[PDB]
């Protein structure tokens, strides 16, 4: 029921004084729908999903103009931050920006975001009130004072509560077949004899959407963390995700262990047990 639209921007000065990399990617939930990448020699905001290709030339001209505008402001930002932190041009630095909106089950505005990182750490973030800023350090307070005097939060609030949510709803209706689907995980358990004394039980979830999932091990109905292993949810490369959870168990004790799968595509949570 609940949904999100997110833009992710990475700006990388590389060693020396060459032109920086700029990449923009747009997501609805866990589905990329647009891209622009200077390293791929992008000249236009490009579609990445068939449902967004349906938008006409005025959409694409506008998104191309805006993404080029974002590229320009990141190019300034890189120089500004060198100045704020007294850094030379010789080093490689990274600016990240993320903005977007979430809607609830009723498709009304739940939350907005607008935040930056510099060299892999928080720089500044729009707070939930969409009126105030969290400056992570002294340098970011300069940005905060500037953005307060210019009423930037008030302009962002207009986009995050209005445009962002209005266009997210349009996409959810136009890309219905893709965006408003759940693909339930295909689940199975494997067994690998580590030695005469121990066996690995691996609990598998394949071809699920969205990415959000919980795999937990229980032992005789009690939560089990010790001798557990859980890999990051990973993309299959067809718009679905994969994940496994493993536990190493004493030989002959396999039957005590259950893997529990939760996903919004499932009628009900699943329980898997190793079976002779």
């Amino acid at each position: 029921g609940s949904h999100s639209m997110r833009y992710f921007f990475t700006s990388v000065s590389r060693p020396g004084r060459g032109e920086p990399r700029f990449i923009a990617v747009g997501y609805v939930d866990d589905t990329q729908f647009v891209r622009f990448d200077s390293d791929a020699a992008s000249q236009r905001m490009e579609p990445r999903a068939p449902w967004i290709e349906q938008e006409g030339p005025e959409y694409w001209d506008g998104e191309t103009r805006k993404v080029k505008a974002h590229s320009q402001t990141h190019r300034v930002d890189l120089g500004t931050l060198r100045g704020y932190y007294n850094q030379s041009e010789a080093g490689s630095h990274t600016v990240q920006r993320m903005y977007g909106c979430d809607v609830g089950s009723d498709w009304r505005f739940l939350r907005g975001y607008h935040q930056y990182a510099y060299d892999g750490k928080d720089y500044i973030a729009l707070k939930e009130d969409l009126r105030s800023w969290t400056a992570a350090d002294m340098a970011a307070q300069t940005t905060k004072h500037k953005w307060e005097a210019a009423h930037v939060a008030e302009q962002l609030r207009a986009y995050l509560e209005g445009t962002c949510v209005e266009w997210l709803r349009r996409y959810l209706e136009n890309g219905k077949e893709t965006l408003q689907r759940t693909d339930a995980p295909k689940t199975h358990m494997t067994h690998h004899a580590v030695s005469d004394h121990e066996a690995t039980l691996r609990c598998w979830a394949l071809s699920f959407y969205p990415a959000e999932i919980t795999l937990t091990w229980q032992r005789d109905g009690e939560d089990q963390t010790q001798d557990t292993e859980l890999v990051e949810t990973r993309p299959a490369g067809d718009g679905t995700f994969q994940k496994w959870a493993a536990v190493v168990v004493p030989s002959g004790q396999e039957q005590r262990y259950t893997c529990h799968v939760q996903h919004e595509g499932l009628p009900k949570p699943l329980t898997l047990r190793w079976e002779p």
């Binding site: 833009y7 923009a24 747009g26 905001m45 998104e63 805006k66 993404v67 505008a69 974002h70 320009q72 402001t73 300034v76 930002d77 500004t80 931050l81 704020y84 903005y99 930056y116 720089y123 500044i124 940005t143 500037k146 953005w147 930037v152 302009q155 962002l156 986009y159 445009t163 962002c164 266009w167």
Partner: peptide, 9 residues
């Protein structure tokens, strides 16, 4: 839809 205003740190 992208943000339509220019912000600078």
């Amino acid at each position: 839809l992208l943000l339509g205003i220019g912000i600078l740190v």
